[PDB]
Ligand binder design. Structure first.
Ligand SMILES: CC(C)c1cc(-c2noc(NC(=O)C3CC3)c2-c2ccc(CN3CCOCC3)cc2)c(O)cc1O
Length: 208
């Protein structure tokens, strides 16, 4: 059973802007996703300070970057707190309506797309490079779910029957045909070094 939902209008508008605006500095998507993973990792770590059993679903806190040139996907995996079904539906655990409004207002005033993270909606920068994004997630005591959208105003949510994750979130970027540079080891390394040097969890770049 797959449920299909409409994005709030403001979010659909932001996604369209991201997809259709000319902007060459697309590499910022990766910093935003790694930042999100870091925040989710902070949260499970904090909760584990008073309830160690929350780590029964996995003690290692890290981020993996997995390029697949055959499938044309870049996958970012973390072992953070994970999202519930409600989190996914409610704009991936974010106050995206108010964030997206302010961001589009700032862009009107002369801000640039790279500042998206300041408005709490950095996730949507994924659409700079991806034609479709799948988010697979698992929170303690809830089921594993898959969220997916190719923009166009809607997203789906379903119970995921793929490889079980202990706990955390996997973001699978199905890259646009002209954005395969983000599957190359040296390019990814460059971006991580430039934008994510002070992330406090191990980031492992898989090779093929
Ligand atoms: C799909 C995006 C949004 C995403 C979410 C999570 C995640 N898993 O559990 C979570 N649940 C959370 O509560 C974690 C934040 C602690 C999150 C999460 C949700 C929203 C944000 C965006 N923030 C939200 C607030 O404003 C700044 C950006 C970051 C991570 C993640 O680990 C990686 C990601 O790329």
């Amino acid at each position: 059973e797959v449920e299909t939902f409409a994005f709030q209008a403001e979010i659909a508008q932001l996604m369209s802007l991201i997809i259709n605006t000319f902007y060459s500095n697309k590499e910022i998507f990766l910093r935003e996703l790694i930042s999100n993973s870091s925040d989710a990792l902070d949260k499970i770590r904090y909760e584990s300070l008073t309830d160690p059993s929350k780590l029964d679903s996995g003690k290692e806190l890290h981020i993996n970057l997995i390029p697949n040139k055959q499938d044309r996907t870049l996958t970012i995996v973390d072992t953070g707190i994970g999202m519930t079904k409600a989190d996914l539906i409610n704009n991936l655990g974010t106050i995206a309506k108010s964030g997206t409004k302010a961001f589009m207002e700032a862009l009107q005033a002369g801000a640039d797309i790279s500042m998206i993270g300041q408005f709490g909606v950095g996730f949507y920068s994924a659409y700079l490079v991806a034609e479709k994004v799948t988010v697979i997630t698992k929170h303690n005591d809830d089921e594993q779910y898959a969220w997916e959208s190719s923009a166009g105003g809607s997203f789906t949510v379903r119970t995921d029957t793929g490889e079980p994750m202990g706990r955390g979130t996997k973001v699978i970027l199905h890259l646009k045909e002209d954005q395969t540079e983000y599957l190359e080891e040296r390019r990814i390394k460059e971006i991580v070094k430039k934008h994510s040097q002070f992330i406090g969890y191990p980031i492992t770049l898989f090779v093929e």
